[PDB]
Ligand binder design. Structure first.
Ligand SMILES: *[C@@H]1O[C@H](CO)[C@@H](O[C@@H]2O[C@H](CO)[C@@H](O[C@@H]3O[C@H](CO[C@H]4O[C@H](CO)[C@@H](O)[C@H](O)[C@@H]4O[C@@H]4O[C@H](CO)[C@@H](O)[C@H](O)[C@H]4NC(C)=O)[C@@H](O)[C@H](O[C@H]4O[C@H](CO)[C@@H](O)[C@H](O)[C@@H]4O[C@@H]4O[C@H](CO)[C@@H](O)[C@H](O)[C@H]4NC(C)=O)[C@@H]3O)[C@H](O)[C@H]2NC(C)=O)[C@H](O)[C@H]1NC(C)=O
Ligand code: NAG
Length: 209
């Protein structure tokens, strides 16, 4: 004795993109070789659901199994604050273990998005940094990408959301492009996906005129 349960929320980009699959993951550790069977029961706002997929158990190096149940959440249900409950049953458990999860509960706040052209010190060089400042958003769940002429620009680094003095979040996204591309006057756009924006999406464009 005995097993432990950990419940994980979906990835932010999965929650914000219609083509992606947002999943809540119920992980059971310390499952015995003697009694390796785990019964998973799932509830959405107290209502039982039967659409979760279990994965084949894995032997840990500490000679125990790690057993996982993955529940697909509806994009709208997750955003509307529905509660996801995982109930775990196992013979080595006198009473089942339950864990509940839902989206962060504070008041949603819309991100403010600003673009920063390369600084004269930054601009003289071979490759230039284009910056997208995203601040004042809540919850921290967000997705920031770059684009030009309808195609993704992949040479970017986005900082993790940082908790600010007023309890909201902020981050920077920096795209590195060849100076020649920026200098030419090509339009680079910063894409921001967040629940509180109108239509959960905004974009800010940056170009040298
Ligand atoms: C046998 O060996 C096993 C494998 O090594 C080992 O399993 C490990 O067991 C420990 C505890 O014994 C368990 O620890 C918990 O880990 C939580 C994070 O797990 C994440 O992230 C880690 C690394 O950061 C990864 O290794 C995990 O795979 C898992 O990854 C996430 O997985 C999901 C689904 O797969 C993905 O969607 C995510 O992308 C992914 N993230 C990453 C970064 O990869 C960690 O959060 C836990 O801390 C919290 O719970 C503790 C419980 O004791 C608290 O003490 C601690 O304070 C934290 O509290 C929680 O946090 C908040 C505070 O209230 C609230 O959210 C919660 O209410 C609260 N919970 C409470 C109080 O219960 C925690 O340390 C490891 O995850 C696990 N590793 C794996 C791989 O399974 C076994 O223990 C070994 N057996 C032994 C030693 O006997
Ligand atoms: C651009 O900014 C990134 C991230 O802040 C940094 O690592 C890099 O060295 C800067 N300059 C260029 C030319 O990318």
């Amino acid at each position: 004795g005995g097993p432990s349960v950990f419940l994980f929320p979906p990835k932010p980009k999965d929650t914000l993109m219609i083509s992606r699959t947002p999943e809540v993951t119920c992980v059971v550790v310390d499952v015995s070789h003697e009694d390796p069977e785990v019964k998973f029961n799932w509830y959405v706002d107290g209502v039982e659901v039967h659409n979760a997929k279990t994965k084949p158990r894995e032997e840990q190096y500490n000679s125990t199994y790690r057993v996982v149940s993955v529940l697909t959440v509806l994009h709208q249900d997750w955003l509307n604050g529905k509660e996801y409950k995982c109930k775990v049953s196992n013979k080595a458990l006198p009473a089942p273990i339950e864990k509940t999860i839902s989206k962060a509960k504070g008041q949603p706040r819309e991100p403010q998005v600003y673009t920063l052209p390369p600084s004269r010190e930054e601009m003289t060089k071979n490759q230039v940094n284009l910056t997208c400042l995203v601040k004042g958003f809540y919850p921290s769940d967000i997705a920031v990408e770059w684009e030009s002429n309808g195609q993704p620009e992949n040479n970017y680094k986005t900082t993790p959301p940082v908790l600010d003095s007023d309890g909201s979040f902020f981050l920077n996204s920096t795209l590195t492009v060849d100076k020649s591309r920026w200098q030419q006057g090509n339009v680079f756009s910063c894409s921001v996906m967040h629940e509180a924006l109108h239509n959960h999406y905004t974009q800010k464009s940056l170009s040298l005129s």
